[PDB]
Scaffold this active site. Structure first.
Site, PDB file in Angstrom:
ATOM      1  N   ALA A 119      10.161   5.358   5.490  1.00  0.00           N
ATOM      2  CA  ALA A 119      11.790   5.650   5.790  1.00  0.00           C
ATOM      3  C   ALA A 119      12.100   4.120   6.525  1.00  0.00           C
ATOM      4  O   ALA A 119      13.173   3.412   6.287  1.00  0.00           O
ATOM      5  CB  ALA A 119      12.101   6.706   6.931  1.00  0.00           C
ATOM      6  N   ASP A 135       2.896  16.943   9.788  1.00  0.00           N
ATOM      7  CA  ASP A 135       3.295  16.449   8.252  1.00  0.00           C
ATOM      8  C   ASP A 135       2.099  16.158   7.344  1.00  0.00           C
ATOM      9  O   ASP A 135       1.827  15.376   6.679  1.00  0.00           O
ATOM     10  CB  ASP A 135       4.214  15.327   8.263  1.00  0.00           C
ATOM     11  CG  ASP A 135       4.716  15.058   6.849  1.00  0.00           C
ATOM     12  OD1 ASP A 135       5.061  15.932   6.187  1.00  0.00           O
ATOM     13  OD2 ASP A 135       5.285  13.952   6.433  1.00  0.00           O
ATOM     14  N   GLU A 176       7.447  -0.311   5.268  1.00  0.00           N
ATOM     15  CA  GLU A 176       6.128  -0.322   4.380  1.00  0.00           C
ATOM     16  C   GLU A 176       4.882  -0.629   5.027  1.00  0.00           C
ATOM     17  O   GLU A 176       4.940  -1.015   6.133  1.00  0.00           O
ATOM     18  CB  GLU A 176       6.557  -1.414   3.290  1.00  0.00           C
ATOM     19  CG  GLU A 176       7.432  -1.140   2.032  1.00  0.00           C
ATOM     20  CD  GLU A 176       8.806  -1.145   2.571  1.00  0.00           C
ATOM     21  OE1 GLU A 176       9.355  -2.213   2.813  1.00  0.00           O
ATOM     22  OE2 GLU A 176       9.650  -0.089   2.496  1.00  0.00           O
ATOM     23  N   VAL A 177       3.943  -0.416   4.218  1.00  0.00           N
ATOM     24  CA  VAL A 177       2.490  -0.698   4.660  1.00  0.00           C
ATOM     25  C   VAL A 177       1.725  -1.643   3.617  1.00  0.00           C
ATOM     26  O   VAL A 177       2.244  -1.458   2.311  1.00  0.00           O
ATOM     27  CB  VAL A 177       1.622   0.751   4.759  1.00  0.00           C
ATOM     28  CG1 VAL A 177       0.228   0.528   5.056  1.00  0.00           C
ATOM     29  CG2 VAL A 177       2.114   1.662   5.710  1.00  0.00           C
ATOM     30  N   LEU A 186       0.782  -1.107   0.071  1.00  0.00           N
ATOM     31  CA  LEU A 186       0.131  -0.252  -0.007  1.00  0.00           C
ATOM     32  C   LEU A 186       0.830   1.277  -0.186  1.00  0.00           C
ATOM     33  O   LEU A 186       0.523   2.367  -0.594  1.00  0.00           O
ATOM     34  CB  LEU A 186      -0.984   0.051   1.482  1.00  0.00           C
ATOM     35  CG  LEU A 186      -1.915  -0.923   1.290  1.00  0.00           C
ATOM     36  CD1 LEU A 186      -2.863  -0.757   2.394  1.00  0.00           C
ATOM     37  CD2 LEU A 186      -2.828  -1.394  -0.049  1.00  0.00           C
ATOM     38  N   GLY A 187       1.925   1.184   0.660  1.00  0.00           N
ATOM     39  CA  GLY A 187       2.878   2.327   0.598  1.00  0.00           C
ATOM     40  C   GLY A 187       4.159   2.047   1.042  1.00  0.00           C
ATOM     41  O   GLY A 187       4.722   0.818   1.079  1.00  0.00           O
ATOM     42  N   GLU A 188       5.290   2.996   1.118  1.00  0.00           N
ATOM     43  CA  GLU A 188       6.534   2.659   1.664  1.00  0.00           C
ATOM     44  C   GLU A 188       6.996   3.932   2.287  1.00  0.00           C
ATOM     45  O   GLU A 188       7.250   5.138   1.541  1.00  0.00           O
ATOM     46  CB  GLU A 188       7.324   2.298   0.383  1.00  0.00           C
ATOM     47  CG  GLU A 188       8.861   2.590   0.409  1.00  0.00           C
ATOM     48  CD  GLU A 188       9.495   1.741  -0.649  1.00  0.00           C
ATOM     49  OE1 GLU A 188       8.981   1.258  -1.687  1.00  0.00           O
ATOM     50  OE2 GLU A 188      10.686   1.112  -0.486  1.00  0.00           O
ATOM     51  N   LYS A 199       1.644  -1.676   9.138  1.00  0.00           N
ATOM     52  CA  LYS A 199       2.952  -0.947   9.052  1.00  0.00           C
ATOM     53  C   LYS A 199       4.206  -1.673   9.495  1.00  0.00           C
ATOM     54  O   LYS A 199       3.997  -2.159  10.723  1.00  0.00           O
ATOM     55  CB  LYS A 199       2.944   0.444   9.682  1.00  0.00           C
ATOM     56  CG  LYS A 199       3.956   1.348   9.218  1.00  0.00           C
ATOM     57  CD  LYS A 199       3.921   2.887   9.560  1.00  0.00           C
ATOM     58  CE  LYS A 199       4.934   3.492   9.050  1.00  0.00           C
ATOM     59  NZ  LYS A 199       4.983   5.050   9.640  1.00  0.00           N
TER      60      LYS A 199
HETATM   61  C1  LIG Z   1      -1.404   2.385  -7.220  1.00  0.00           C
HETATM   62  N1  LIG Z   1      -1.982   3.276  -6.038  1.00  0.00           N
HETATM   63  C2  LIG Z   1      -0.753   3.254  -5.262  1.00  0.00           C
HETATM   64  C3  LIG Z   1      -1.298   4.217  -3.942  1.00  0.00           C
HETATM   65  N2  LIG Z   1      -2.522   3.422  -3.467  1.00  0.00           N
HETATM   66  C4  LIG Z   1      -2.753   3.281  -2.139  1.00  0.00           C
HETATM   67  C5  LIG Z   1      -2.032   4.146  -1.413  1.00  0.00           C
HETATM   68  C6  LIG Z   1      -2.413   4.057   0.159  1.00  0.00           C
HETATM   69  C7  LIG Z   1      -3.031   3.257   0.632  1.00  0.00           C
HETATM   70  C8  LIG Z   1      -3.540   2.981   2.017  1.00  0.00           C
HETATM   71  C9  LIG Z   1      -4.808   2.329   2.506  1.00  0.00           C
HETATM   72  N3  LIG Z   1      -5.189   2.395   4.003  1.00  0.00           N
HETATM   73  C10 LIG Z   1      -4.201   2.704   4.723  1.00  0.00           C
HETATM   74  N4  LIG Z   1      -4.235   2.603   6.157  1.00  0.00           N
HETATM   75  C11 LIG Z   1      -3.290   3.393   6.621  1.00  0.00           C
HETATM   76  C12 LIG Z   1      -2.776   3.431   8.052  1.00  0.00           C
HETATM   77  N5  LIG Z   1      -1.572   3.900   8.130  1.00  0.00           N
HETATM   78  C13 LIG Z   1      -0.702   4.422   7.144  1.00  0.00           C
HETATM   79  C14 LIG Z   1       0.340   4.851   7.599  1.00  0.00           C
HETATM   80  N6  LIG Z   1       1.272   5.274   8.029  1.00  0.00           N
HETATM   81  C15 LIG Z   1      -1.136   4.285   6.046  1.00  0.00           C
HETATM   82  C16 LIG Z   1      -2.325   3.471   5.658  1.00  0.00           C
HETATM   83  C17 LIG Z   1      -2.997   3.332   4.554  1.00  0.00           C
HETATM   84  C18 LIG Z   1      -2.472   3.348   3.154  1.00  0.00           C
HETATM   85  C19 LIG Z   1      -4.056   2.385  -0.211  1.00  0.00           C
HETATM   86  C20 LIG Z   1      -3.510   2.343  -1.496  1.00  0.00           C
HETATM   87  C21 LIG Z   1      -3.699   3.545  -4.503  1.00  0.00           C
HETATM   88  C22 LIG Z   1      -3.216   2.647  -5.534  1.00  0.00           C
END
Ligand SMILES: CN1CCN(c2ccc(-c3cnc4[nH]c5cnc(C#N)cc5c4c3)cc2)CC1
EC number: 2.7.11.1
Length: 264
Positions: free
Chosen positions: A17, A121, A20-21, A13-15, A36
């Site tokens: 420092a 932030d 990752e998530v 879902l993310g990345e 996370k």
């Molecule tokens: C190709 N794209 C890439 C980015 N995408 C995307 C980006 C972020 C999330 C997402 C969803 N729920 C989430 N719940 C979270 C709770 N904490 C964090 C943190 N730190 C981050 C999250 C978090 C991120 C889900 C998808 C959407 C698709």
């Protein structure tokens, strides 16, 4: 409902420092959550603060668990992804949508400020959307306490993300927490209505910031923005944090209260 905590990791879902998530899908309940996964080979504080938060515009915390050097944080999943991806480059989004998002952002921020937490932030990458397009503040990895026992502590650590940081963070040794969050919310609103960021950073060595202080709103991004929301941005993006508009007064703004969007 036995085996209620058993997850399978499906997607990055993310990345950050540290790590990752990941999206984690449940066993018997079939629940989805975000995890996370930070590799320690900061999060202690991030967990403490996360444990305090309970608001419909803040990403919910479930729990934590470490296995050797890898701390896991279990958090609410947001299927709408980041606000960042709802902003069309050079365009932004429809003004009624930006307004709703801004309303929810203010609700989340007021809540955090009310319990003496500053996020430090705020940006569209950290503002996530649930299944019904509701906005949730995430990533408390830079967050800190600015009020405790009803007593405010001035901040001095430079942190955040330069296009979003308030100018006093670059100019003064100490500064109040809440105006810094208000400022970044203004930059977020600018991005939503214009699809671009106004400057690299708010220093006098940045010509776009100088232009803004000189009130050249005939330039981008300002010329793309309607007079009503622009008038609010004039009150938020004020260099003196003591003169800057506060959230109570943002709540009374003409655009903030303009009827724009029909209900579902
Ligand atoms: C190709 N794209 C890439 C980015 N995408 C995307 C980006 C972020 C999330 C997402 C969803 N729920 C989430 N719940 C979270 C709770 N904490 C964090 C943190 N730190 C981050 C999250 C978090 C991120 C889900 C998808 C959407 C698709």
């Amino acid at each position: 409902v036995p085996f209620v905590e058993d997850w399978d990791l499906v997607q990055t879902l993310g990345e950050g420092a540290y790590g990752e998530v990941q999206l984690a899908v449940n066993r018997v309940t079939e629940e989805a959550v975000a995890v996370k996964i930070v590799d320690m080979k900061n999060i202690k504080k991030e967990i403490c603060i996360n444990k305090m938060l309970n608001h419909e515009n803040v990403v919910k915390f479930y729990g934590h668990r470490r296995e050797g050097n890898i701390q896991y944080l279990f958090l609410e999943y947001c299927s709408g992804g980041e606000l960042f991806d709802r902003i069309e480059p050079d365009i932004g989004m429809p003004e009624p949508d930006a307004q709703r998002f801004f309303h929810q952002l203010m609700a989340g921020v007021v809540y955090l400020h009310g319990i003496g937490i500053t996020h430090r932030d705020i940006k569209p990458e950290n503002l996530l959307l649930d299944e019904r397009d509701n906005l949730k503040i995430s990533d408390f990895g830079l967050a800190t306490v600015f009020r405790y026992n009803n007593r405010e502590r001035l901040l001095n650590k430079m942190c955040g993300t330069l296009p979003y940081v308030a100018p006093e963070l670059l100019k003064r040794r100490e500064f109040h927490a809440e105006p810094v969050d208000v400022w970044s919310c203004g930059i977020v609103l600018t991005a939503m209505l214009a699809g671009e960021l106004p400057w690299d950073q708010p220093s006098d060595s940045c010509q776009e910031y100088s232009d803004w202080k000189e009130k050249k709103t005939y330039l981008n991004p300002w010329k793309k923005i309607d007079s009503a929301p622009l008038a609010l941005l004039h009150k938020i993006l004020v260099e003196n944090p003591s003169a800057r508009i506060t959230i109570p007064d943002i709540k009374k703004d003409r655009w903030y209260n303009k009827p724009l969007k029909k209900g579902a």
